[PDB]
Nucleic acid binder design. Structure first.
Ligand SMILES: [Mn+2]
Ligand SMILES: [Zn+2]
Length: 207
RNA sequence: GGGC
RNA sequence: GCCC
C-alpha cells in the first residue's frame, strides 16, 4: 500500500543476530549462490563457501502461487504448505548484509543478478560458470547421497516426458562447486543461520 | 543452449 | 508450462 512504510522485515534484535552470524562468511572466499523460484518471487535461497563448509539456507513464501505450482512441476518440487513457517524479510536482510563488492559464483547468473539488482546490490560481482546441464550436474547423485538431510522441502515429482531429481538451491551450490573442482570432498557442512531465524519455532495450549 |  |  501507498500508506505502508516498513523499513525492515526483521527486528533490530534479529538483524543484529544475523549480522553476527554472517561474520562466519569470509568476504573473500569462493561463494556460490543459487535460488529456487523466480528472481522477483524467490522461494529458496542458498549461499555456500566450500573452503569452510559454511552455508546460508532459508525459504520464503511465494506471492504468485499459480506460477509457483508450475515451477514446482518443472524444477524445484517444493511443497507450498512446507513454506508456511518461514521468516518474512529474510531474503532482503541477508542480501543487504552481504559484504560490499563481494564476488559470487553461480550457474546461469541472469536470475541471481536480477534478484541482487532488485535489492540495490549492483556492487556485487557475479562469475557465471556457464556449464551445460550435464557438466553442471555430474555430481548431482553423489551430493544428494551425502547431504540429503540438509533439505527436506523437495517432495514433489519433477518432470523434464521423464521424471528428474528436484532442483534444490543448496544441493545445486554443492554440486556446481564439485563440478568445477572436479570432485566432491567428504566433509560435514555448517549452517550459518540459527534454526529459529529461518523457521517459526515451537505453544503449550491453543488460544 | 541456459534458468525456474 | 513459463522466463532469459
Ligand atoms: Mn540457479
Ligand atoms: Zn532445498
Amino acid at each position: 500500500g501507498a500508506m505502508d512504510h516498513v523499513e525492515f522485515g526483521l527486528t533490530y534484535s534479529q538483524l543484529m543476530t544475523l549480522k553476527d552470524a554472517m561474520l562466519q562468511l569470509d568476504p573473500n572466499a569462493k561463494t556460490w549462490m543459487d535460488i529456487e523460484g523466480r528472481p522477483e518471487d524467490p522461494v529458496e535461497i542458498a549461499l555456500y563457501q566450500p573452503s569452510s563448509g559454511c552455508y546460508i539456507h532459508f525459504f520464503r513464501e511465494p506471492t504468485d502461487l499459480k506460477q509457483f505450482k508450475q515451477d514446482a512441476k518443472y524444477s524445484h518440487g517444493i511443497d507450498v504448505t512446507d513454506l508456511f513457517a518461514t521468516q518474512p524479510g529474510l531474503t532482503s536482510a541477508v542480501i543487504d548484509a552481504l559484504p560490499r563488492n563481494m564476488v559470487i559464483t553461480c550457474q546461469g547468473s541472469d536470475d541471481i543478478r536480477k534478484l541482487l539488482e532488485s535489492q540495490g546490490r549492483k556492487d556485487i560481482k557475479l562469475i557465471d560458470i556457464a556449464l551445460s546441464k550435464t557438466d553442471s550436474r555430474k555430481y548431482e547423485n553423489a551430493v544428494w547421497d551425502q547431504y540429503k538431510d540438509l533439505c527436506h522441502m523437495h517432495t514433489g515429482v519433477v518432470v523434464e516426458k521423464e521424471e528428474i531429481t528436484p532442483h534444490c538451491a543448496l544441493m545445486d551450490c554443492i554440486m556446481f562447486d564439485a563440478a568445477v573442482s572436479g570432485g566432491l570432498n567428504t566433509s560435514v557442512l555448517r549452517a550459518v543461520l540459527p534454526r529459529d531465524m529461518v523457521f517459526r519455532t515451537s505453544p503449550r495450549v491453543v488460544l
